Amino acid sequence: GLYPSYNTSPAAPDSTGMQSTAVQLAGKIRLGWNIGNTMEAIGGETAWGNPMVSNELLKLVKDSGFDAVRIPVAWDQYANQESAEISAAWLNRVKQVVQMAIDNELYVLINIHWDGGWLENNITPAKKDENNAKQKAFWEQIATHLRDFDEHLLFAGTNEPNAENAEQMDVLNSYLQTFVDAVRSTGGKNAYRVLVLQGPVTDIEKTNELWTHMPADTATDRLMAEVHFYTPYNFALMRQDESWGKQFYYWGEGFLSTTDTERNPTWGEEATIDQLFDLMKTKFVDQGIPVVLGEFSAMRRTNLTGDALTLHLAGRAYYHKYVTQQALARGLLPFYWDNGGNDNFSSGIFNRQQNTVFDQQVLDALLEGAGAQ
């Protein structure tokens, strides 16, 4: 093999604290929070402006009404490029963060994120073999090191794998199978752990078009699918007008501008959100496969001013409430994308520097959406 085996201590299978099926575990999660721009940051945990994950942050996330965290994690930059050995200090750091989250009674989804793109931007026949070898080596290590956590810990094999056609989807299916095999090979509680597999680009329409099967699993009923959501992009993330379209500042029936109508959406309103989520209910949920809505948020436009800003913030809160509520009604588990920022074009709802709530308006909307307030 390209790399040595990192399945060095496989353990007898253990179902202790692993008694929930995927469907049962999904029923315990109504609202999640991503620790964005932190453990996945290129250059290190603080490189993208957030503090190291703290117990105080995880206590505040739980106390604020979240049931779960999604923890984007980088790995490649911590690995020896000859051996694929991940730094012991980094594996211990991730284990410490998982332990703190579980100490605060959160469910935890750990992934390999974009991670500088080694996998994510390389869903190609040319990279298939070398990426399967690194996927296997990395997951053997991650799974071995985190093997003793109970079913509060879930694994997600990839983030937003760039598969745009059937040929790339076949490569992605292989990367997902490698993930499952590697985790299961380590035994112990990893014989039973719920694993989460990503649709192509985590895009609902591409998933609907290209996805055909889950990986084979030695476990039964321990898999979930994952999609993300930024629809409509013009509202949620777009930071400048383009030749092909304009930023929307406003979203939601009864949160639309009567004055600057050109900043209201021309597509991607409530009916489209329902339509897209129904595709996933049809394909996955109503076939007994829960869906993790692993990443969604519409960024704050604090570069607006006055009545326009007020109207923007009211429709942004409504967008988050609507997405959360409509996801849950259709069996998608909503995980809010928080990049930690509190300035323009950001998504942090907490002030991470001081462990306080920065944006109670969006927090309230998420909790109302979840039926929590």
Automatic annotation (TrEMBL):
EC number: 3.2.1.4
A GO cellular component entry from the record: extracellular region
Span of the signal peptide: none
Single annotated GO MF: cellulase activity
Broad EC category: hydrolase
Glycoside hydrolase family domain location: 37-342
Keywords: Carbohydrate metabolism, Cellulose degradation, Glycosidase, Hydrolase, Polysaccharide degradation
One GO term of the biological process aspect: cellulose catabolic process
Family: Belongs to the glycosyl hydrolase 5 (cellulase A) family.
Protein name as annotated: Cellulase, putative, cel5D
Species of the source: Cellvibrio japonicus (strain Ueda107)
